[PDB]
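Deviations from the work plan: none for this task. Representative record:
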Amino acid sequence: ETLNGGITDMLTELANFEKNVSQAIHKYNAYRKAASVIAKYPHKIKSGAEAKKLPGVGTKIAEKIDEFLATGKLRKLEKIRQDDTSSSINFLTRVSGIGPSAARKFVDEGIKTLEDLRKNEDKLNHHQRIGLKYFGDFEKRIPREEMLQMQDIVLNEVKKVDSEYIATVCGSFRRGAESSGDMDVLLTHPSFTSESTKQPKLLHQVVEQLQKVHFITDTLSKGETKFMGVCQLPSKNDEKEYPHRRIDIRLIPKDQYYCGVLYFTGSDIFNKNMRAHALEKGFTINEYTIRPLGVTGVAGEPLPVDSEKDIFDYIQWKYREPKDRSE
DNA sequence: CATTAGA
DNA sequence: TCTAATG
Ligand SMILES: [K+]
Ligand SMILES: [K+]
């Protein structure tokens, strides 16, 4: 957590680069498990040699741990950090719609900058266009205060189109967070569960709603079960407009709500841990359901859930308010 | 780890 | 159809 930090961050630094600037899936993967093992290790790595005794720890990496250890740096690390191309890549990637494939592709064409990107909007797709459009606004955080104004308007048309709708704004928001990155609305309907063969419109109706009202301003992708867009709070009585915010809405069989709800509400660790526990408590938790375990090894048969509670009850735990779902 | 675009 | 990008 801190004793082996240098090495770990250096390494990830190492790996992240291979994956991205290079196509080195493997080396990248390599650096990963190592950085992973070196982290669990309970002692201070004093030499590569020492490290090397590990799993995943090759001669390659160990050599690296020595240099870092010996001198407070690393060249390869120092070289990469300097490398314009590589830098170039890392940058373009912040543009929503741009993954590493495009990054490189773009680079080679010689598009390395924001401006570069502009001059050639042509070369970009709608997703990337929009990402280009709101590059600033998108990198900007969501102050809860806003989160609240946003959630409000949201539950509102939801309710308007149909009363029977159940929406929830999951994530760090749901969990308290002074600010979030984007809004994650989970959606469902009684009229849609596991079997009841869809109702695409179900998703559709609402999108159109929020649109109709100018809440939703763009569409990144719209599918029959998962919308991904851009939104904005009605710029007041002037002098102050709101930044363009990313939003995601997703359909869900009423029968799989709370788990999913449970789930996306995290936190990452609360989840895992809650999940670890269901195992002992003779269960299995996963994004959609909760099944009891059968001694033979495994088992099936999804237990019925009407709320965050049943799943809690089930594993005979303490209902944790989202606020404290922290870990 | 599954849904969407796009080509 | 595949492959990329999101989450
Ligand atoms: K080894
Ligand atoms: K990106």
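The beta strands of chain A are 142-143, 166-170, 179-180, 183-188, 216-222, 226-231, 245-250, 283-286, 289-292.
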